[PDB]
Design a protein around this nucleic acid. Structure first.
Ligand SMILES: [Mg+2]
Ligand SMILES: [Mg+2]
Ligand SMILES: [Mg+2]
Ligand SMILES: [Mg+2]
Ligand SMILES: [Mg+2]
Ligand SMILES: [Mg+2]
Ligand SMILES: [Mg+2]
Ligand SMILES: [Mg+2]
Ligand SMILES: [Mg+2]
Ligand SMILES: [Mg+2]
Ligand SMILES: [Mg+2]
Ligand SMILES: [Mg+2]
Ligand SMILES: [Mg+2]
Ligand SMILES: [Mg+2]
Ligand SMILES: [Mg+2]
Ligand SMILES: [Mg+2]
Ligand SMILES: [Mg+2]
Lengths: 190, 201, 345
RNA sequence: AACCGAACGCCGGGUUAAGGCGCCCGAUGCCGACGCUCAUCAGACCCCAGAAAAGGUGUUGGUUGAUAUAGACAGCAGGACGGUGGCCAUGGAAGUCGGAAUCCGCUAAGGAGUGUGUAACAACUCACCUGCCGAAUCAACUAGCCCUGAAAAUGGAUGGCG
RNA sequence: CAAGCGUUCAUAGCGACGUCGCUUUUUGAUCCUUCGAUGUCGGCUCUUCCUAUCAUUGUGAAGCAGAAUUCACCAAGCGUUGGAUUGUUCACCCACUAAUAGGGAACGUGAGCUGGGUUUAGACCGUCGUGAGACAGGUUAGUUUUACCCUACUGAUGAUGUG
RNA sequence: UGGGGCGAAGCUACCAUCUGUGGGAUUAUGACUGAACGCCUCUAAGUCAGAAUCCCGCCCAGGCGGAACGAUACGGCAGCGCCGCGGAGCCUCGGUUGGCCUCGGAUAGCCGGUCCCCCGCGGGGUCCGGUGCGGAGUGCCCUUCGUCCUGGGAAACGGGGCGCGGCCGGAGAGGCGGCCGCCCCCUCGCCCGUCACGCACGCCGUUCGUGGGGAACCUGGCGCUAAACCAUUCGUAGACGACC
């Protein structure tokens, strides 16, 4: 069954100014500017609210499986807005029995340098993506802070080091060591 | 129609095009398919890679240099698909293939000619917009081209050039239109007779 | 039915139109990737094989049983007098491959270089390169070489330098030089050209191209061995003492079903005289010819500082079976493909 | 060979069967209807030339039964008790290795218990019942279409091309 | 599907009573092809393919702490040996390793071999036969052709085309 | 090869020695965002990491596949390349105006103009104004197609002489444009008068791309001025052939 219409309005705050080039949404607030293309999903993105109050995504002659996606675009747009207003912060706390996982950021964000996970001589290196500023925290012991505007980029990068730090040929029930994400949040909370 | 054909491969469907080419090759018309990297295929990227790699394993065991020639350039790939739609064992079929001619990128003479597009092989038309695909360019690469990078950098060089011409041609039309208005009372009873039997309205 | 008792194949296929080579100066097939940042250099050269010898070096591989011991390494010595650059040549990239624009060689030329053109020469009138040269001095000496280099600057990408060997200097009976394009892997065309411009006609020795202790790859043609039976060629088993029709064979070529003998079954054929690219050989010593300032310097050859005799690498009675190495050699670790006197890229 | 049509002096025109109609290859170079599916092994025609039980909120239709503005469903908060080491079992089973059973109070609502787990508890959780939200929600079947089951030897066959 | 085992617990690992399939490396049926006879068993050598993965790479499992181990996925990339006995295929043992996985290609391969075993004619014992003689009942001796012809392949000259 | 020691040269042996080299796509798998499914979800649209895999790279062969540039037959008789422009004639055919150009999007594009802003006459930006079953529309545009007379109007410096020199720009396998002096010559598109052209007496391959492609021969100017194979030799190679 094709559903004649499905739609959704995103409520855009007074801080930000989205401006869509056809289908491609660009978002600029305090923090910076983000962009993303929905040159796949195939919907009608209107900016109906004057002053500038609403993104409305339509979908229109759509069967079930594209009706899904109405809401997913609607999300990556909120998720941009939160990114360019507040900005995200994933915290990730290192975990162990014994060998201290020994982290050291090494340009600005960029290189996250890990000696000694489980006594291993090989020093794991991990790049961040562009726009992702890693930094070793304070007010807490074994704990990184990945700051960035883009969720997509910030959470590969969590996951890259969370996955770079995996044990092999053991019980990972027992060997519960490595670095992993403890708290997805924001820089500014409001 | 008459004369030499030039088809711009981009945005077409590999075999859907080739059937149309091959019909007109057999009717004596000279076709020149260009830009075959751009040519694209239904089914998702990998599907057709996996399907190509299946081809590559097909190979005359007792000697392979006899066995099938899995050419790698898109020109060549398409040729193959056209050729399979000709009776190429026979003289008219080989005489046909000779009327075909196929390039990767868009060369001398053929940069410098306006050039056509088969809507009935055209992807936007033939396919549904919610379906997946390969470019024979990227397919050709992952199967053993050496020349995706080169035919990129050359086409970028050609595009920049062609843009100049398009813009100068754009500037002549602006002169045509301004010069119609700058002389519209000694062609104001010819333009009349144009618009009366349809021409120019 | 399966083979009862498994075993590896005999002798690789990735190698196997085992034919007498079509060429003989080892053709270089791939020129290293020119990173446009580091200076201009030539990437190849063209010595020739002399003979071999016992080198004694102190070792420095901490960890090994032979840290800090003497060892003897067998070495070749490749007679490598300086190569003259005659001409340059420009390659443009294309979809269809890598076509070549514009070969330009010098005013002058040589005479050994002439050799590597007209087969029988004493018959010939030696006319090669006689109206080319005429261009290196007139009004069309400014057209087709100046507008040309400007052209090879503009559209071109990769530039090689045709260089002929100095055959005359050698003890070989040969007089016919060994031309080859040697790629210039410099920084940027123009810089990689206003340079070749300058090295036309000009000597080029081994110490420009190469450094002592660089790993290099030797490219040459295998030493010839004629027709060989399968057991010498493909190195197979022998059949037992009993066998009625020949025991230096392969019993079973194929199954009486794939009804062709295959591709990849062992066979009689030309062995040796094959082209081969051997890689990653070390240079132990870059030599120096016995030159004059008063009365020879035979010394400056085999006289290492830890012995200080006055030897030439030439042993007593020459490198058996060509002669005395009278100019710049390179001493290479181990053995290299090909017989004595062989052109070695 | 043997299926289907059709029974063949030799020809022109017309017309058909069984078949077909991107192109090989004659015919759709219908501005053809209405549907269904996307196969990381698609499917693609009586023989005939390949698969099954069985799987499969892959998607699409039914069927039946449910639930609900006295405001559900889903989500986030609070309780989940007492009579009560209830009885059997004791080896511990006070709700809980197991079973007969086996119901009241406070009731709001809490099963003499779904489980975690605990030697047994606790502590936690779940039924039950609340708090917050606003309208559709849920379950079992049954079918359509695809996915899995599904593994073979010179290279590879909806006929090929696609 | 699922009754069980597995201390407990179906399903980590297993799994009865039932039941649905493949596969053609087992033997049968069958008798379609060949009796102007396609060389009839094993061994050697040599290729190549399959996976029905014994090792190794990357992985998901475990009743996985480690160590060690089995279940499974992609996966066929490179591996799978030396011997005593035995005509043997088949076996069993010693030994090494990393493994000592399983298979196909006219039960791969006699103008490749050998001919040990089958299976001629000479012989010997066992039994049966009155006998000639019989016996998957033993045992020793027993001629193993021909390539030059087209093809495949391996090399080698060459070929039309580019004046 | 009477026997046997020792034995250069040459072959030759884990029986001596040397050398074996790198990227990409992703499988399983593991993940990010995140839908269906006001939550959760590796996924429904999007991403990421990922191998003895696969493909490629080094490596080996090198096409009824191309490249560049050399020299081009002195002659004792030769024979040609251009270039131009000349005269006959075998043959092999197909054709019977051209179109001289953006990029791509497709739940979007096209064009104008910028007043304004930034960059290198252009490019990018912002604003407005038009077109968008598209009219600076491949349903498209252009150019003409029986000949010349002469004697009006509309149109007036257009065209030409293989007219002639110089400077451009164009290289992916260019083969083409483009743009500047000077000579001589001509006055053509559209209306109209006005006359004319073998009017072949209803008939077929009519019209051009045509100075086609190719193969044979009659004029001038300028250049040209061999190599290949055999024989011989050598071996770097060997059956002979092949090759240095
Ligand atoms: Mg372990
Ligand atoms: Mg095996
Ligand atoms: Mg014998
Ligand atoms: Mg039990
Ligand atoms: Mg026979
Ligand atoms: Mg498997
Ligand atoms: Mg043995
Ligand atoms: Mg057999
Ligand atoms: Mg035989
Ligand atoms: Mg045989
Ligand atoms: Mg016998
Ligand atoms: Mg007998
Ligand atoms: Mg007796
Ligand atoms: Mg008796
Ligand atoms: Mg990768
Ligand atoms: Mg995945
Ligand atoms: Mg990736």
């Amino acid at each position: 069954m094709k559903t004649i219409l499905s739609n959704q309005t995103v409520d855009i705050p007074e801080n930000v100014d989205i401006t869509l080039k056809g289908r491609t949404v660009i978002v600029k607030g305090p923090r910076g500017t983000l962009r993303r293309d929905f040159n796949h999903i195939n919907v009608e993105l209107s900016l109906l609210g004057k002053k500038k109050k609403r993104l409305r995504v339509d979908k229109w002659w759509g069967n079930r499986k594209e009706l899904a996606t109405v809401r997913t675009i609607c999300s990556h747009v909120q998720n941009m807005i939160k990114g360019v207003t507040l900005g995200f912060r994933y915290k990730m706390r290192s975990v162990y029995a014994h060998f201290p996982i020994n982290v050291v950021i090494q340009e600005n964000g960029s290189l996250v340098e890990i000696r000694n996970f489980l006594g291993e001589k090989y020093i794991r290196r991990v790049r961040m993506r562009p726009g992702v500023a890693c930094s070793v925290s304070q007010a807490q012991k074994d704990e990184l802070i990945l700051e960035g505007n883009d969720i997509e980029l910030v959470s590969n990068s969590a996951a890259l080091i969370q996955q770079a730090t995996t044990v092999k040929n053991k019980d990972i029930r027992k060997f519960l060591d490595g670095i992993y994400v403890s708290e997805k949040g924001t820089v500014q909370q409001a | 129609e008459g004369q030499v054909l030039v088809l711009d491969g981009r945005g077409h469907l590999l075999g859907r095009l080739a059937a149309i080419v091959a019909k007109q090759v057999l009717l004596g018309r000279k076709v020149v398919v260009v830009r075959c990297e751009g040519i694209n295929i239904s089914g998702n990227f990998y599907r057709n890679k996996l399907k190509y790699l299946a081809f590559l394993r097909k190979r005359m065991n007792t000697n392979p240099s006899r066995g099938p020639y899995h050419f790698r350039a898109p020109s060549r790939i398409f040729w193959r698909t056209v050729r399979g739609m000709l009776p190429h064992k026979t003289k008219r079929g080989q005489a046909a293939l000779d009327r075909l001619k196929v390039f990767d990128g868009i060369p001398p003479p053929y940069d410098k000619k306006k050039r056509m597009v088969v809507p009935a092989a055209l992807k936007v038309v033939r396919l549904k917009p919610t379906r997946k695909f390969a470019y024979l360019g990227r397919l050709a690469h992952e199967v053993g081209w050496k020349y995706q990078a080169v035919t990129a950098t050359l086409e970028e060089k050609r595009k920049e050039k062609a843009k100049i011409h398009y813009r100068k041609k754009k500037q002549l039309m602006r002169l045509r239109k301004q010069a119609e208005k700058n002389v519209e009372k000694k062609i104001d009873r010819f333009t009349e007779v144009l618009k009366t039997h349809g021409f120019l309205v | 039915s399966h083979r009862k008792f498994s075993a590896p194949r005999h002798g690789s296929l990735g190698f196997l139109p085992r034919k007498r080579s079509s060429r003989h100066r080892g053709k270089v097939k791939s020129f290293p990737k020119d990173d446009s940042s580091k200076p201009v250099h030539l990437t190849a050269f063209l010595g020739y094989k002399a003979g071999m010898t016992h080198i004694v070096r102190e070792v420095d591989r901490p960890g090994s049983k032979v840290n800090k011991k003497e060892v003897v390494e067998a070495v070749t010595i490749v007679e490598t007098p300086p190569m003259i650059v005659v001409g340059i040549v420009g390659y443009v990239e294309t979809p269809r491959g890598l076509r070549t624009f514009k070969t330009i060689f010098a005013e002058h030329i040589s005479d050994e270089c002439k050799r590597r053109f007209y087969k029988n020469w004493h018959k010939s009138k030696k006319k090669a390169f006689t109206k080319y040269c005429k261009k290196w001095q007139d009004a069309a000496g400014a057209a087709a070489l100046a507008a040309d280099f400007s052209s090879m600057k503009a559209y071109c990408q990769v530039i090689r330098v045709i260089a002929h060997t100095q055959m005359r200097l050698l003890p070989l009976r040969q007089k016919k030089a060994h031309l080859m394009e040697i790629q210039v892997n410099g920084g940027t065309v123009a810089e990689k050209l206003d340079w070749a411009r300058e090295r036309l006609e000009q000597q080029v020795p081994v110490n420009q191209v190469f450094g002592q202790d660089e790993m290099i790859d030797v490219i040459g043609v295998t030493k010839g061995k004629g027709y060989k039976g399968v057991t010498s060629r493909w190195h197979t088993k022998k059949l037992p003492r009993k066998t009625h029709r020949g025991l230096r064979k392969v019993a079973c070529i194929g199954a009486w079903h794939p009804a062709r003998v295959a591709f990849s079954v062992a066979r009689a054929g030309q062995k040796g005289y094959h082209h081969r690219t051997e890689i990653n050989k070390k240079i132990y010593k870059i030599g120096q010819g016995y030159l004059i300032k008063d009365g020879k310097l035979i010394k400056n050859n085999a006289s290492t500082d830890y012995d200080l005799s006055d030897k030439s690498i030439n042993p007593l009675g020459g490198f058996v079976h060509y002669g005395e190495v009278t100019n710049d050699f390179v001493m290479l670790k181990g053995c290299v493909v090909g017989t004595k006197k062989r052109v070695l890229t």
